[PDB]
Structure 1
Amino acid sequence: HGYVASPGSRAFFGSSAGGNLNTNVGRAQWEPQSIEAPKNTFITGKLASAGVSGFEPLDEQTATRWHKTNITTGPLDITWNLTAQHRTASWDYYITKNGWNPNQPLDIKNFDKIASIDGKQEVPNKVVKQTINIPTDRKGYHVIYAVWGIGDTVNAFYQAIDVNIQ
């Protein structure tokens, strides 16, 4: 169990720790760490919630619905907080392509992978800091999809992150 705290994930921003910068986020208000589903679950319109019961409000998609963190292209520091550390297989990061439609349901086919870090089947610390590169053809509102793949189960934790790139 864990979430991306920086840049704040869509779920994290729903919690008091995230400043309640997103409203009406269902279970994300209290447990943004709990978005757990089998690996390779990428159902169109159900990426933000990973299809998980109680997280449905996260799946709404418009250009103005969610709070964005202002970022630049190039290096971006990602910080996860884990409320329950687990042996880890992988960390994968995707971002929406230039030209994607922010008023349409999220579809993984409209993202590129942009980083992949091997967990080496070890147990990470409760704060995990990684650096990924944001490609320079991205400007404006984009969604980063951060995926923590568990080493000793068939599951992953899924974190949609709303960013405004300038």
Structure 2
Amino acid sequence: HGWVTDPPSRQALCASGETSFDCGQISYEPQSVEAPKGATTCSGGNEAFAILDDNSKPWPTTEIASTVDLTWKLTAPHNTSTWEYFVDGQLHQTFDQKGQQPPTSLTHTLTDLPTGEHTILARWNVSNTNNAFYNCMDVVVS
């Protein structure tokens, strides 16, 4: 369990009360967006958190540069295979954890992000289960 805190993901903004709409249950457990490997949606297909896929909502955006430091907060650091990052649904960067347990505070540096409005998807793959954790960040790159 864990979620991306900076730049804040959709479940982070819900849990911190930064959205102008009620997000439901996810507001109380942002660390729990868990779903089988292989998806590219913000919820991963977890039906209890379907609001995270609704793009009609006025989701807030974050202004960032093309090179940005991205921070996770883990509550239960499971042995990890890879951390995958997509930009608008297309794989951008991969980090290999070699099946090791990560630190509960973890920072990665993304580079070469395209300018304009985009949505990053962070996919955390657990090495000893069939599940991953899904985090979306809406951003404006300049």
Normalised to the residue count of structure 1, the TM-score between the two structures is 0.80
Name the SS for the 1:34 alignment partner.
coil
- Aligned equivalents of 1:79 and 1:25: distance in 2? 22
The alignment of Structure 1 onto Structure 2 pairs a total of residues equal to 141
Retained in 2: the 8 A contact 1:24–1:57? no
- Aligned equivalents of 1:27 and 1:133: distance in 2? 33
Name the SS for the 1:147 alignment partner.
strand
Instruction: Give the Å deviation of 1:91.
Output: 0.1
Q: Is 1:94 aligned with 2:94?
A: no
For residues 43-122 of structure 1, what are the structure 2 equivalents within 5 Å? 47-62=41-56, 65-73=58-66, 75-96=67-88, 111-122=89-100
Q: Which runs of 5+ in 2 are unaligned?
A: none
Aligned position for 1:39: 37
Q: Which runs of 5+ in 1 are unaligned?
A: 97-110
Runs (4+) of structure 1 exceeding 3 A deviation are none
- Aligned equivalents of 2:55 and 2:84: distance in 1? 22
User: Which is helix-richer, 1 or 2?
Assistant: 2
Retained in 2: the 8 A contact 1:26–1:56? no
Aligned position for 1:149: 125
- Aligned equivalents of 2:45 and 2:79: distance in 1? 23
Code of the aligned partner of 1:165: V
Instruction: Give the Å deviation of 1:59.
Output: 1.2
Name the SS for the 2:10 alignment partner.
coil
Of 74, 80, 102, the residue aligned with 1:124 is 102
Q: 1:134 to 1:7 in 2, by over 3 A?
A: farther
